[PDB]
Protein backbone atom coordinates (compact mmCIF):
# COMPACT_ATOMS: atom_id res chain seq x y z
CA UNK A 1 0.00 0.00 0.00
CA UNK A 2 1.50 3.27 1.20
CA UNK A 3 4.63 1.62 2.61
CA UNK A 4 5.53 0.98 -1.04
CA UNK A 5 4.68 4.49 -2.24
CA UNK A 6 7.25 5.85 0.21
CA UNK A 7 9.77 3.31 -1.06
CA UNK A 8 9.50 4.17 -4.75
CA UNK A 9 9.64 7.93 -4.08
CA UNK A 10 12.75 7.74 -1.89
CA UNK A 11 14.44 5.34 -4.32
CA UNK A 12 13.83 7.60 -7.31
CA UNK A 13 14.98 10.76 -5.54
CA UNK A 14 17.57 9.53 -3.02
CA UNK A 15 18.88 6.01 -3.50
CA UNK A 16 19.36 5.94 -7.27
CA UNK A 17 21.69 8.93 -7.17
CA UNK A 18 23.74 7.59 -4.27
CA UNK A 19 24.24 4.24 -5.99
CA UNK A 20 25.42 6.00 -9.14
CA UNK A 21 27.72 8.35 -7.22
CA UNK A 22 29.12 5.29 -5.41
CA UNK A 23 29.58 3.39 -8.69
CA UNK A 24 27.29 0.62 -7.44
CA UNK A 25 25.39 1.21 -10.71
CA UNK A 26 26.07 2.91 -14.02
CA UNK A 27 24.37 6.03 -15.35
CA UNK A 28 22.62 3.84 -17.92
CA UNK A 29 20.86 2.02 -15.08
CA UNK A 30 19.25 5.25 -13.86
CA UNK A 31 15.64 5.93 -14.79
CA UNK A 32 14.91 8.94 -17.04
CA UNK A 33 13.66 10.68 -13.90
CA UNK A 34 16.92 9.92 -12.09
CA UNK A 35 19.02 11.02 -15.08
CA UNK A 36 17.30 14.42 -15.09
CA UNK A 37 17.62 15.25 -11.39
CA UNK A 38 21.20 13.94 -11.49
CA UNK A 39 22.17 17.12 -13.36
CA UNK A 40 21.04 19.52 -10.64
CA UNK A 41 22.48 17.15 -8.03
CA UNK A 42 25.78 17.01 -9.91
CA UNK A 43 25.95 20.81 -10.05
CA UNK A 44 25.21 21.06 -6.34
CA UNK A 45 28.08 18.61 -5.75
CA UNK A 46 30.41 20.77 -7.86
CA UNK A 47 29.26 23.96 -6.12
CA UNK A 48 29.83 22.29 -2.76
CA UNK A 49 33.28 20.95 -3.66
CA UNK A 50 34.43 24.48 -4.56
CA UNK A 51 33.53 25.59 -1.03
CA UNK A 52 34.68 22.70 1.18
CA UNK A 53 36.48 19.36 1.14
CA UNK A 54 34.66 17.11 3.60
CA UNK A 55 36.89 14.71 5.55
CA UNK A 56 34.95 11.77 6.96
CA UNK A 57 36.04 9.44 9.78
CA UNK A 58 33.37 6.81 10.44
CA UNK A 59 34.18 3.36 11.78
CA UNK A 60 30.84 2.13 13.11
CA UNK A 61 27.10 2.06 12.60
CA UNK A 62 26.57 4.37 15.57
CA UNK A 63 29.05 6.99 14.41
CA UNK A 64 27.20 7.13 11.10
CA UNK A 65 23.80 7.55 12.74
CA UNK A 66 24.99 10.21 15.17
CA UNK A 67 27.03 12.26 12.71
CA UNK A 68 24.62 11.99 9.79
CA UNK A 69 21.62 12.79 12.00
CA UNK A 70 23.37 15.78 13.54
CA UNK A 71 24.20 17.35 10.19
CA UNK A 72 20.85 16.90 8.49
CA UNK A 73 18.73 17.84 11.52
CA UNK A 74 20.45 21.23 11.58
CA UNK A 75 19.98 21.44 7.80
CA UNK A 76 16.19 21.24 8.16
CA UNK A 77 15.49 22.52 11.69
CA UNK A 78 15.08 25.99 10.17
CA UNK A 79 12.86 24.91 7.27
CA UNK A 80 12.54 22.58 4.28
CA UNK A 81 12.89 23.40 0.59
CA UNK A 82 13.89 21.51 -2.54
CA UNK A 83 17.32 23.13 -2.72
CA UNK A 84 18.13 21.81 0.73
CA UNK A 85 16.89 18.35 -0.23
CA UNK A 86 19.49 18.54 -3.00
CA UNK A 87 22.08 19.10 -0.26
CA UNK A 88 20.63 16.26 1.80
CA UNK A 89 20.93 13.92 -1.20
CA UNK A 90 24.47 15.01 -2.07
CA UNK A 91 25.62 14.88 1.56
CA UNK A 92 24.27 11.34 1.86
CA UNK A 93 26.13 10.38 -1.32
CA UNK A 94 29.48 11.74 -0.12
CA UNK A 95 29.34 9.90 3.22
CA UNK A 96 28.36 6.74 1.37
CA UNK A 97 31.25 6.99 -1.09
CA UNK A 98 33.67 7.49 1.79
CA UNK A 99 32.44 4.22 3.26
CA UNK A 100 32.63 2.18 0.06
CA UNK A 101 36.03 3.68 -0.76
CA UNK A 102 37.24 2.97 2.79
CA UNK A 103 35.99 -0.61 2.31
CA UNK A 104 34.42 -0.50 5.78
CA UNK A 105 31.21 -2.19 4.51
CA UNK A 106 29.08 0.59 6.04
CA UNK A 107 27.75 2.22 2.84
CA UNK A 108 24.43 0.38 3.13
CA UNK A 109 24.14 1.87 6.62
CA UNK A 110 24.51 5.41 5.25
CA UNK A 111 21.91 4.81 2.53
CA UNK A 112 19.53 3.20 5.01
CA UNK A 113 20.13 5.99 7.51
CA UNK A 114 19.31 8.64 4.90
CA UNK A 115 16.36 6.58 3.64
CA UNK A 116 14.87 6.51 7.13
CA UNK A 117 15.39 10.21 7.82
CA UNK A 118 13.85 11.24 4.50
CA UNK A 119 10.94 8.87 5.07
CA UNK A 120 9.89 10.32 8.41
CA UNK A 121 11.28 13.86 8.46
CA UNK A 122 11.04 15.04 4.84
CA UNK A 123 8.53 12.95 2.91
CA UNK A 124 5.44 14.65 4.44
CA UNK A 125 6.77 18.01 3.21
CA UNK A 126 7.84 16.58 -0.16
CA UNK A 127 4.44 15.04 -0.86
CA UNK A 128 2.46 18.03 0.43
CA UNK A 129 4.45 20.21 -2.01
CA UNK A 130 3.92 18.21 -5.18
CA UNK A 131 6.20 15.28 -4.44
CA UNK A 132 8.02 13.82 -7.40
CA UNK A 133 6.46 16.02 -10.08
CA UNK A 134 7.67 19.20 -8.36
CA UNK A 135 11.23 18.05 -7.67
CA UNK A 136 11.53 17.13 -11.35
CA UNK A 137 10.07 20.52 -12.28
CA UNK A 138 12.48 22.12 -9.81
CA UNK A 139 15.37 20.36 -11.53
CA UNK A 140 14.15 21.33 -15.01
CA UNK A 141 13.62 24.95 -13.95
CA UNK A 142 17.22 25.01 -12.73
CA UNK A 143 18.34 23.96 -16.23
CA UNK A 144 17.93 27.64 -17.17
Amino acid sequence: GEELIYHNIINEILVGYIKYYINDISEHELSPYQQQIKKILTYYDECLNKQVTITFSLTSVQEIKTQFTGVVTELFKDLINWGRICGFIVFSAKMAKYCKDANNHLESTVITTAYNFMKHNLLPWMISHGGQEEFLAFSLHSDM
Binding site: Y43, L48, I54, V72, R84
Partner: peptide, 20 residues
Protein backbone atom coordinates in the same frame (compact mmCIF):
# COMPACT_ATOMS: atom_id res chain seq x y z
CA UNK B 1 33.49 21.69 11.50
CA UNK B 2 30.32 19.60 11.40
CA UNK B 3 28.12 22.61 12.16
CA UNK B 4 30.15 24.40 9.50
CA UNK B 5 29.17 21.81 6.90
CA UNK B 6 25.47 22.08 7.75
CA UNK B 7 25.60 25.88 7.41
CA UNK B 8 27.24 25.47 4.00
CA UNK B 9 24.64 22.89 2.99
CA UNK B 10 21.93 25.41 3.95
CA UNK B 11 23.30 28.36 1.95
CA UNK B 12 24.02 26.51 -1.29
CA UNK B 13 20.67 24.82 -0.73
CA UNK B 14 18.83 28.12 -0.39
CA UNK B 15 20.89 29.34 -3.33
CA UNK B 16 19.77 26.50 -5.58
CA UNK B 17 16.21 27.01 -4.35
CA UNK B 18 16.10 30.68 -5.33
CA UNK B 19 17.93 30.23 -8.63
CA UNK B 20 15.04 28.02 -9.71
Amino acid sequence: TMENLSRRLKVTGDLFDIMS
